[PDB]
Amino acid sequence: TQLLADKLKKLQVKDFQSIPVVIHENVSVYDAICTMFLEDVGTLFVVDRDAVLVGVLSRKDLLRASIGQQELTSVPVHIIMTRMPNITVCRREDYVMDIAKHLIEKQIDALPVIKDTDKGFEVIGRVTKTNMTKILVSLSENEIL
Amino acid sequence: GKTGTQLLADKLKKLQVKDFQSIPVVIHENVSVYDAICTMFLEDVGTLFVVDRDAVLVGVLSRKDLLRASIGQQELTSVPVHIIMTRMPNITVCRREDYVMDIAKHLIEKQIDALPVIKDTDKGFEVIGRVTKTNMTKILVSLSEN
Numbered sequence: 001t002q003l004l005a006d007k008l009k010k011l012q013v014k015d016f017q018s019i020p021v022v023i024h025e026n027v028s029v030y031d032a033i034c035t036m037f038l039e040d041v042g043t044l045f046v047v048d049r050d051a052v053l054v055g056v057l058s059r060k061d062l063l064r065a066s067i068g069q070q071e072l073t074s075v076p077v078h079i080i081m082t083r084m085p086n087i088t089v090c091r092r093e094d095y096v097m098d099i100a101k102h103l104i105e106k107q108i109d110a111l112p113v114i115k116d117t118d119k120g121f122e123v124i125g126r127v128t129k130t131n132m133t134k135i136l137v138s139l140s141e142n143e144i145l
Numbered sequence: 146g147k148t149g150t151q152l153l154a155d156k157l158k159k160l161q162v163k164d165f166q167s168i169p170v171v172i173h174e175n176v177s178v179y180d181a182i183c184t185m186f187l188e189d190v191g192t193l194f195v196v197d198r199d200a201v202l203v204g205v206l207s208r209k210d211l212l213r214a215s216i217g218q219q220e221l222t223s224v225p226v227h228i229i230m231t232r233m234p235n236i237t238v239c240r241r242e243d244y245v246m247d248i249a250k251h252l253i254e255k256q257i258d259a260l261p262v263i264k265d266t267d268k269g270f271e272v273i274g275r276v277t278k279t280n281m282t283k284i285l286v287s288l289s290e291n
């Protein structure tokens with residue numbers, strides 16, 4: 001069954017990703033909390049003026065910010081975001097099984113899927129524990145290959 | 146079934162919650178919203194289950210429930226969590242002997258991250274575990290190891 005596991009490890013991010021939710025690094029913390037409710041997501045990807053990834057924000061980053069303090073309306077997200085270069089990213093060509101291992105091992109809910117352009121990391125997707133959950137359901141209904 | 150993938154499917158469909166749950170994190174319903182946000186960080190979970198005096202489930206709190214409370218234009222951080230929690234009877238729960246893939250479908254269909262695993266008692270549901278999308282991710286990882 002090593003061969004079966006092998007074939008599973010060849011499934012790629014492009015076929016199982018979700019749209020990215022992105023915010024500009026100068027948007028306020030209040031604005032980022034709004035986007036996360038309007039978009040109903042749990043992780044936000046922060047980009048610069050040239051649309052290049054610079055940061056991520058999670059719910060707890062925002063909840064940490066929201067006690068107290070600290071004028072959420074006046075505070076730019078770049079002040080609190082988790083910053084590049086310490087963001088775990090993937091590309092559409094990566095194998096979802098490797099990306100599941102990063103979500104686990106890095107203890108995070110989502111990766112940005114980026115494309116390496118002649119500008120930097122442009123954000124083109126997200127892959128989360130929801131996408132993983134769905135792939136697992138699909139496997140159990142023999143709906144993949 | 147007749148292919149390796151069908152055999153895969155067949156196993157997946159027989160996994161039970163009791164073998165793939167995590168420890169539950171529970172708070173009393175009189176704890177303040179600030180205290181619940183403290184617990185969430187202290188315990189490193191994204192969903193807290195709320196119980197009453199008799200350790201029976203009465204509610205759940207998610208990260209966004211607490212974020213909404215902390216930034217809303219009413220002062221809600223000082224209030225008891227029972228003011229803001231999602232309340233019974235409208236909690237999706239599971240039991241130890243439920244099938245994991247049935248739970249994964251509810252997580253997806255109901256767009257929530259976690260269910261409490263409960264046991265029925267004569268006073269109501271006792272919280273005895275949690276199953277979340279993190280659990281499901283770990284099962285997916287094990288497939289490529291095993």
Ligand SMILES: Nc1ncnc2c1ncn2[C@@H]1O[C@H](COP(=O)(O)OP(=O)(O)NP(=O)(O)O)[C@@H](O)[C@H]1O
Nearest residue numbers: 056057058059060082087088107108109110111189
């Ligand atoms: N892809 C990522 N790469 C690097 N850091 C990340 C990434 N995703 C989130 N983070 C940071 O990692 C921390 C954990 O985020 P995440 O876990 O996804 O959400 P959380 O709401 O903060 N809690 P949790 O689910 O318990 O880990 C936060 O400080 C994030 O900003």
Ligand SMILES: Nc1ncnc2c1ncn2[C@@H]1O[C@H](COP(=O)(O)OP(=O)(O)NP(=O)(O)O)[C@@H](O)[C@H]1O
Nearest residue numbers: 040207208209210231235236237256257258259260
């Ligand atoms: N098991 C459950 N049964 C009923 N409601 C739940 C359950 N788990 C969470 N909820 C509620 O459903 C809403 C969405 O929860 P959940 O999704 O888990 O987290 P959020 O951080 O609020 N993010 P999201 O994953 O994007 O909807 C919140 O009001 C929760 O209180």
Ligand SMILES: [Mg+2]
Nearest residue numbers: 042043058109
């Ligand atoms: Mg997150």
Ligand SMILES: [Mg+2]
Nearest residue numbers: 191207208209
């Ligand atoms: Mg949450």
